[PDB]
Amino acid sequence: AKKGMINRELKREKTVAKYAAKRAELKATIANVNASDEERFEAMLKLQALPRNASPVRLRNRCGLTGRPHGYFRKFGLSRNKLRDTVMQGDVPGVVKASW
Amino acid sequence: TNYGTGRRKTATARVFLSAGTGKLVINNRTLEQYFGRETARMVVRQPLELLEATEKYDLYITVKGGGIGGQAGAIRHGITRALIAADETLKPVLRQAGFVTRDAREVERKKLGLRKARKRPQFSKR
Amino acid sequence: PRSLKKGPFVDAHLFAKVEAAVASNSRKPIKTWSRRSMILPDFVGLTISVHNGRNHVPVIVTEHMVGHKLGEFAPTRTYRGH
Amino acid sequence: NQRIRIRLKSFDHRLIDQSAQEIVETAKRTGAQVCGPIPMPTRIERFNVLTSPHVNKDARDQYEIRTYKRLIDIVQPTDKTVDALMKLDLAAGVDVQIAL
Amino acid sequence: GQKVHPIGIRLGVVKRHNANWYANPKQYAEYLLKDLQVREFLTKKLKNAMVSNILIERPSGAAKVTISTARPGIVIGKKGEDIEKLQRELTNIMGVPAQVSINEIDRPDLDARLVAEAIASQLEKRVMFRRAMKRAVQNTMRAGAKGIKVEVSGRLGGAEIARTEWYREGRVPLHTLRADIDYATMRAETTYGTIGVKVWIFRGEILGGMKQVMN
Amino acid sequence: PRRRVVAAREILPDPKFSSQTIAKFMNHVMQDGKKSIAESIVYGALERVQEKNKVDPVEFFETTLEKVRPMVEVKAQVPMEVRPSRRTALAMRWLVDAAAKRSEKTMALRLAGELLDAAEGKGAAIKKREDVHRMAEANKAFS
RNA sequence: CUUACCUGGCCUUGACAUACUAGAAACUUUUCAGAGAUGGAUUGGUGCCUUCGGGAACCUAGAUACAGGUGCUGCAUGGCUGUCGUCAGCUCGUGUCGUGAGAUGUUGGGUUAAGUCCCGCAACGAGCGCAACCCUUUUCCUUACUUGCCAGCAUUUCGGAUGGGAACUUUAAGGAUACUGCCAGUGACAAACUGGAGGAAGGCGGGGACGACGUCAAGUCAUCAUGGCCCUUACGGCCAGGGCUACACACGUGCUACAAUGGUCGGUACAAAGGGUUGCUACACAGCGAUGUGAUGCUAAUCUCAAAAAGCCGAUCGUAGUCCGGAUUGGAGUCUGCAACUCGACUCCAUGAAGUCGGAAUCGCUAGUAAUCGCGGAUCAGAAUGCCGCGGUGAAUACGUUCCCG
Numbered sequence A: 001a002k003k004g005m006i007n008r009e010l011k012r013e014k015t016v017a018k019y020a021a022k023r024a025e026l027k028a029t030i031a032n033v034n035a036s037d038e039e040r041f042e043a044m045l046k047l048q049a050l051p052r053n054a055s056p057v058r059l060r061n062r063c064g065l066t067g068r069p070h071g072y073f074r075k076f077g078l079s080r081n082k083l084r085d086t087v088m089q090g091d092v093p094g095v096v097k098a099s100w
Numbered sequence B: 001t002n003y004g005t006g007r008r009k010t011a012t013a014r015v016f017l018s019a020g021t022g023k024l025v026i027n028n029r030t031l032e033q034y035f036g037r038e039t040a041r042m043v044v045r046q047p048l049e050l051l052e053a054t055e056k057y058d059l060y061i062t063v064k065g066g067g068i069g070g071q072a073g074a075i076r077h078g079i080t081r082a083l084i085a086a087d088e089t090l091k092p093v094l095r096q097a098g099f100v101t102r103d104a105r106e107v108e109r110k111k112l113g114l115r116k117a118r119k120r121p122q123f124s125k126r
Numbered sequence C: 001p002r003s004l005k006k007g008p009f010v011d012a013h014l015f016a017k018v019e020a021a022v023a024s025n026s027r028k029p030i031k032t033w034s035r036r037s038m039i040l041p042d043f044v045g046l047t048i049s050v051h052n053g054r055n056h057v058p059v060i061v062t063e064h065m066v067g068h069k070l071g072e073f074a075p076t077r078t079y080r081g082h
Numbered sequence D: 001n002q003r004i005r006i007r008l009k010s011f012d013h014r015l016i017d018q019s020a021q022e023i024v025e026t027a028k029r030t031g032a033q034v035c036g037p038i039p040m041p042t043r044i045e046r047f048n049v050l051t052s053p054h055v056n057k058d059a060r061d062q063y064e065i066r067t068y069k070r071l072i073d074i075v076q077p078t079d080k081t082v083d084a085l086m087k088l089d090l091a092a093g094v095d096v097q098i099a100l
Numbered sequence E: 001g002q003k004v005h006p007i008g009i010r011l012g013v014v015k016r017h018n019a020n021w022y023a024n025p026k027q028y029a030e031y032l033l034k035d036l037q038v039r040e041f042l043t044k045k046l047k048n049a050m051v052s053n054i055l056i057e058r059p060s061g062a063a064k065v066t067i068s069t070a071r072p073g074i075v076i077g078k079k080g081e082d083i084e085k086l087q088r089e090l091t092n093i094m095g096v097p098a099q100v101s102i103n104e105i106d107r108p109d110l111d112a113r114l115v116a117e118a119i120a121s122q123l124e125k126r127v128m129f130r131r132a133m134k135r136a137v138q139n140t141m142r143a144g145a146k147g148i149k150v151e152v153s154g155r156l157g158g159a160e161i162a163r164t165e166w167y168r169e170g171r172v173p174l175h176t177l178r179a180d181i182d183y184a185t186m187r188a189e190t191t192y193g194t195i196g197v198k199v200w201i202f203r204g205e206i207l208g209g210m211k212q213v214m215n
Numbered sequence F: 001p002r003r004r005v006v007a008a009r010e011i012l013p014d015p016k017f018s019s020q021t022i023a024k025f026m027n028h029v030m031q032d033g034k035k036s037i038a039e040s041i042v043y044g045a046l047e048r049v050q051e052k053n054k055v056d057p058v059e060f061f062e063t064t065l066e067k068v069r070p071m072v073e074v075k076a077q078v079p080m081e082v083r084p085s086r087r088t089a090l091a092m093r094w095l096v097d098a099a100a101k102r103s104e105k106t107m108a109l110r111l112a113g114e115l116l117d118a119a120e121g122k123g124a125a126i127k128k129r130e131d132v133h134r135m136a137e138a139n140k141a142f143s
Numbered sequence G: 001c002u003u004a005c006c007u008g009g010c011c012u013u014g015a016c017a018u019a020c021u022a023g024a025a026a027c028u029u030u031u032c033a034g035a036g037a038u039g040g041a042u043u044g045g046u047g048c049c050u051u052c053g054g055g056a057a058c059c060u061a062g063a064u065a066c067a068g069g070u071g072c073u074g075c076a077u078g079g080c081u082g083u084c085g086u087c088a089g090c091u092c093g094u095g096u097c098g099u100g101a102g103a104u105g106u107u108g109g110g111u112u113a114a115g116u117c118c119c120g121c122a123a124c125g126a127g128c129g130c131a132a133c134c135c136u137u138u139u140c141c142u143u144a145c146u147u148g149c150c151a152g153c154a155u156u157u158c159g160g161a162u163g164g165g166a167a168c169u170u171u172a173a174g175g176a177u178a179c180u181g182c183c184a185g186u187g188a189c190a191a192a193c194u195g196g197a198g199g200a201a202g203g204c205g206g207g208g209a210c211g212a213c214g215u216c217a218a219g220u221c222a223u224c225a226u227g228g229c230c231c232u233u234a235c236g237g238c239c240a241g242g243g244c245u246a247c248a249c250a251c252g253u254g255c256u257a258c259a260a261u262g263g264u265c266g267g268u269a270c271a272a273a274g275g276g277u278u279g280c281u282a283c284a285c286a287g288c289g290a291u292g293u294g295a296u297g298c299u300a301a302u303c304u305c306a307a308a309a310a311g312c313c314g315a316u317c318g319u320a321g322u323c324c325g326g327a328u329u330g331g332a333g334u335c336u337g338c339a340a341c342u343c344g345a346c347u348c349c350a351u352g353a354a355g356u357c358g359g360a361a362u363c364g365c366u367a368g369u370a371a372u373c374g375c376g377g378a379u380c381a382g383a384a385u386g387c388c389g390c391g392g393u394g395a396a397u398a399c400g401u402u403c404c405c406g
């Protein structure tokens, strides 16, 4: 991938990490019943006011060695191109060729 | 008093056979309650009917796994082994009838590049 | 559609612009990129120029348009026939 | 009835069996009575990986990874059993958990 | 046609993995990425020490790295300063404290990766590739391999059109699963591009299987 | 096949009446593996005919299949004598095909109707048998 | 967002590395303008190492060598991959005839899945291919007795629920078995091929991985690396809106149907494989429903996704464009997301299109196969009729190699 794209990903991750706590508090306030509708409305408005990169919906899983945005395989944190090589070199514990 | 195990298509049956008058129970249910087809009942009844000893023994059976046909076949196989254990000399008759052989047929796995075990995609001819 | 329990969604900056326009009687069109905002009763009697991708199309809000998104009145694609 | 429960997890059934037998031998030498090991069901996780870099859908490697679990129960434990069990070293690749 | 990886096809048959550790589904990716980073760092730092194999374990909140080398003195240093620095750096890279172990390769000529590295160095220094392949083959066979095969692909001698050529001697039963077959690949970076070098060494058949290997 | 010959696939007899012929016809009737519905159709038709006229179902079915069974064929075009298995297969296929096109609502009673028609002597299967006989006579001289 | 494309708004040693110089702990609280990128204000604080006259981490400002490019060349390359094709071939030594290149072995009779094997022969012998070594399924044995099991005893709020048992099932490690082994034909008396007995299984028992020398300048510079060309106030970098979802048409691959072997309703059975802690959720209540609220147990052979559906029994529909089919559209909602107009999935009421089995042509399949029915997962906030797996019910037909294809 491109280095600018990788750095965009890293910046978005940092923003999410920064805003994790306040966003969760706002969601809890919105979902609280005892609080008045005024407070819930204000919480929703603040949530909408939070910067966009605070939302985890925008994070895209990328390879980790090459930044490839397709074929991710969460369990290994690697895209298929590097996963095949690392598995067939014997550097991924417990993984073999499957036959049944 | 005697025991047998039967296996057919992921189904396993435990058959307890004792001298009796002809009572048959499967999972605390009668044959007609447990199996809805007549073919399943006839398959269950084949061995004793062949031996002409239907009213001679009592059958207490549990089964689990597979479908209705598989369960019927497993019950037949288990009854056959129980009868052989009770009297080895029945083995020639049962092996002639084919109840001794354990059917090893099973579902073939799906294969990469195919819709099923052997069905391929459609191939446009240019 | 957006669940009734959450109410309608309007961008805060657009809402502030509309509030200012209603407070002070000004008919100057309001320029926005917010196609996703929902048209409210307060918009009626106003002119909003809504981005379509390359231009800001003017829209005069009426009572019939209430309950719509601003982008519904600013088509994005151009077609005239093969 | 101060029984102890040991749970072993591994990606190599030979390694986990060796570790379980070592634990059983240590317990028996210490003098306690042991139950097991009991084989718990295995987890099999499969994966499909395109082998070509650009385009060949049918060209794939099939990989699998296996998680094996073993359970050991020690009953009527002697005071000398626990210290020996703690002394017993840790073998790489075999996760061991102990519950009192 | 394309060939399966000789190491990969035998991973549970007659050969071990290069990594031994258990992890939960959540920790598996973190552990893998850290291990790969460690491998990449070590290769660069010990390029000139004739390193072939790296074995990584995470026994319990710790790390153990075993390095198979033909020059243990270079890695160890004068009085252990090099190993201490390396241990500290790996303990920095990996969260848990780490330990380092040295495994001396007594016979470099039966190690596939060292042979490929030597061939690549010669090609980058512009030795004739046919001479390189013949000399490597004869050296390995004197070392005592039951078979040796070497392949070189690219712009040989800076030709405009690339080509591939190979030399084999002895026997190399690739289809035999229980055969001990070391395999390695290597890059030679020349003014005209990249030349790929591949080495296979057949050392006999392992009898008894995994149980004999004592996993 | 080019090399070797494959043995015939043994078919277990019908459990109720112990008739391999009945089992073969039942499999001919079956679609999509719905053996239970095929069994219902066939047993119902046999019971209906038995009740209507008192005759052994197996004997009557064999007798009717004898009437509907063909005699000759032509292979690509030279006439040839059909083998016993192909005779029965063609007969059963013709009966089921003619039933498929019959105009009655259901299949079981509509199968019994065709059985009676074939027994009497007039039917689509009998007409097809006569047609193949005519065409074989027309190509008689060859071979 | 992804995003590489378009419109407009912006930055320039740069979003990212190294070297040089100066000042500042990093950080942290609230506002304002702007669509945002940005710009300008406004709070709290002076650690960690020190031979303390300094230095480490991280920032701000200057500076040039540079960074940056999914820009071009798959015909300059590495690595990787498709295909003939799991087709049975491709070779090498030394001898041998030939002035010679070469031949031979590797050719011939049978046989096999096979250059598989046995027979002949101035050839003798060996390598890479074939086979076997590996995984899975069928029979049995030993070890193991829970969270899994319940034959025999008892206790039962009749639920293995309890006291209990280690028998059976299963779970999962290690072993045995099958080898033309025995028999009769058969054939050159050989290889080999047919038919019997025992056996769970009898002639590679069934599947899977394993891809020879080579061919197509075959595919990939957009996974990645890399020679050489190009851009450098932009061919680099940041942002908000739009597009990748267009629509007079033509092709490939699928799903749903055209109904009675069926549709609707009531009752009632039987699986295997996976998944689950920012997750799956028992149960109660609210709603017609998608769902919501409270609450419970599960880091799982323990709790849960979970209703298997075809099936069976009963009634009704009686061949109608219908009680078949469910496209299109009008209203009204739910959930995920900062946000469902362009452009989500699902739910309810209303509407109810084409379609009554499809020309020439053409495709898959030899057995637990085809056909048919349901169930799970990777990707993933949400978004499968695709892909990769799992089980249930369960056929027809092979006379033969003339004809098409390789």
Ligand SMILES: CN(C)[C@@H]1C(=O)C(C(N)=O)=C(O)[C@@]2(O)C(=O)C3=C(O)c4c(O)c(NC(=O)CN5CCCC5)cc(F)c4C[C@H]3C[C@@H]12
Pocket (backbone or CB within 6 Å): G075, G216, G217
């Ligand atoms: C139908 N289509 C798939 C073809 C097809 O059918 C077949 C086949 N065998 O069937 C194939 O070979 C192909 O696919 C293919 O791959 C080809 C090439 O690469 C190629 C190439 O690279 C250059 N290169 C240059 O001219 C470089 N010059 C240097 C200076 C300026 C240009 C020139 C050139 F004519 C070709 C021919 C193509 C043909 C192509």
Ligand SMILES: [Mg+2]
Pocket (backbone or CB within 6 Å): A001, A002
């Ligand atoms: Mg790059």
Ligand SMILES: [Mg+2]
Pocket (backbone or CB within 6 Å): A057, A059, A060
């Ligand atoms: Mg996403």
Ligand SMILES: [Mg+2]
Pocket (backbone or CB within 6 Å): none
């Ligand atoms: Mg299936």
Ligand SMILES: [Mg+2]
Pocket (backbone or CB within 6 Å): B107, B108, B109
């Ligand atoms: Mg299977």
Ligand SMILES: [Mg+2]
Pocket (backbone or CB within 6 Å): B121, D057
């Ligand atoms: Mg496909």
Ligand SMILES: [Mg+2]
Pocket (backbone or CB within 6 Å): C001
């Ligand atoms: Mg709507």
Ligand SMILES: [Mg+2]
Pocket (backbone or CB within 6 Å): G003
């Ligand atoms: Mg976009």
Ligand SMILES: [Mg+2]
Pocket (backbone or CB within 6 Å): G074, G218
């Ligand atoms: Mg090419």
Ligand SMILES: [Mg+2]
Pocket (backbone or CB within 6 Å): none
């Ligand atoms: Mg191209």
Ligand SMILES: [Mg+2]
Pocket (backbone or CB within 6 Å): E175
């Ligand atoms: Mg092989």
Ligand SMILES: [Mg+2]
Pocket (backbone or CB within 6 Å): G217
């Ligand atoms: Mg080309």
Ligand SMILES: [Mg+2]
Pocket (backbone or CB within 6 Å): none
């Ligand atoms: Mg390109």
Ligand SMILES: [Mg+2]
Pocket (backbone or CB within 6 Å): none
């Ligand atoms: Mg954008």
Ligand SMILES: [Mg+2]
Pocket (backbone or CB within 6 Å): none
């Ligand atoms: Mg598209």
Ligand SMILES: [Mg+2]
Pocket (backbone or CB within 6 Å): none
């Ligand atoms: Mg019914």
